[PDB]
Each structure stands twice: as C-alpha cells, then as structure tokens.
Amino acid sequence: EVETFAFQAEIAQLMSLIINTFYSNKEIFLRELISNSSDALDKIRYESLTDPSKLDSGKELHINLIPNKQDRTLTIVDTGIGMTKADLINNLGTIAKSGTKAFMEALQAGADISMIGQFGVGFYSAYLVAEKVTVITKHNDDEQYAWESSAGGSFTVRTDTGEPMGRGTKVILHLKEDQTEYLEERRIKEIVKKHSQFIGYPITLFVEK
Numbered sequence: 001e002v003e004t005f006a007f008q009a010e011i012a013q014l015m016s017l018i019i020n021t022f023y024s025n026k027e028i029f030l031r032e033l034i035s036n037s038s039d040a041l042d043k044i045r046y047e048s049l050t051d052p053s054k055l056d057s058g059k060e061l062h063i064n065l066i067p068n069k070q071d072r073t074l075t076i077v078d079t080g081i082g083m084t085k086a087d088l089i090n091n092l093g094t095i096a097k098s099g100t101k102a103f104m105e106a107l108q109a110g111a112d113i114s115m116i117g118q119f120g121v122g123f124y125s126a127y128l129v130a131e132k133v134t135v136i137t138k139h140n141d142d143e144q145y146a147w148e149s150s151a152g153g154s155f156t157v158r159t160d161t162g163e164p165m166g167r168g169t170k171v172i173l174h175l176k177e178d179q180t181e182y183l184e185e186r187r188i189k190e191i192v193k194k195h196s197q198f199i200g201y202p203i204t205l206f207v208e209k
C-alpha cells in the first residue's frame, strides 16, 4: 500500500531550483544532512533526561555514513528521535513552506545555496547530488515508514517492510551518475572534517570491500 502525495507548490519550486541552478559547491549537502541528524539526536537525548525508557529502542546515539558503490548510494544513518508518518508527510518535520519563502528572498538578495540550512530546509540540498532520495524512519510513537521522492512534484509514503531500525532515520541518496565522488572514502572524510568537525556525536564512515 503506497500513498502518493503532491509537494506543496513552494516546496516543488525549492526542489526545482536546487536541481536546475548552476552551483558547483554541491558538497554542502552532507553537512546539512549531518546537522539534521545531530538535531534529531539532541531531541531524543533531551527526552531521555526525564524518561529513560525513551531509549529502550536503542541507547546508542550516533551517525553512520555508508557508501555503496554497487548500488550507487550514500546512506546517512542516525539513531535520533525519528519521524512519525505525520511528520514525514508534513515536509519531514520542518516548516518548509515558510523556510522556503525566507530562503528564496535571501537568494534574490545575494545569498547562495550553501546557506540553505539557516532556513530550516537543508534536507532538500540532497537533490544537489541525488536523483532519488529514500528516507526510512522509526519514531517511538509510530511504525517504521519509508518516504521517497525523485522530485517531479510528488513523494510517496509506505510502511517499511525492510530491516527494522529500532529508532532513528536513514537517508538513502541514490546519487546522480556524475556525483559518484561522494562514495569515495577520502572525499567523504574531507567533507566531514571541513564542515562537521564540531558535531557532538560519533560519525563513523563505513568502508567497502
């Protein structure tokens, strides 16, 4: 059972701008996704300070980066708070309508795409490098769901029958053919060191056979 939804017009416009604007500094997508993971880990940590059972679904608070050259995917995994089905549908837990409005006003006023995270819509920078994004998520208060979009104005949500996650979010980037540098260990290490050096959770870069 797959449900297909239309993006709000403003979010579709944000995604088309990200896909179509000439902008060479694409590597910032990874900083934005890691920042979102850190924010989600902060939320479950805060909840656990008054209710330790919030971590019954997993005590470890971490971020994993998993490149797969055979599938041409880069996956960002975190054990943060996750997202309910309602959160997924409501722009992955963001205020993306008002954030897009502010972002595009900033762009016409001199800003560049790298400042997207200051407007709460950094997730959509994934489309700088990915032709399709799949988001698998599990929140303590809901079941495990898969969101997916290749842009083009629509996204899908379905219950996920894949590997149970316990709690957290996996962002699977199906990379564009010309963006495979983001599967190379030395390139990922460079970006993490440049942009994510002060993230307060362990970031483990997995290696491949």
Ligand SMILES: Cc1ccc(C(N)=O)cc1C
Residues within 6 Å of the ligand: 036, 037, 040, 078, 080, 081, 082, 083, 091, 092, 093, 094, 123, 168, 169
């Ligand atoms: C937009 C978004 C996507 C994934 C996560 C996460 N890693 O929980 C958080 C946000 C705000």
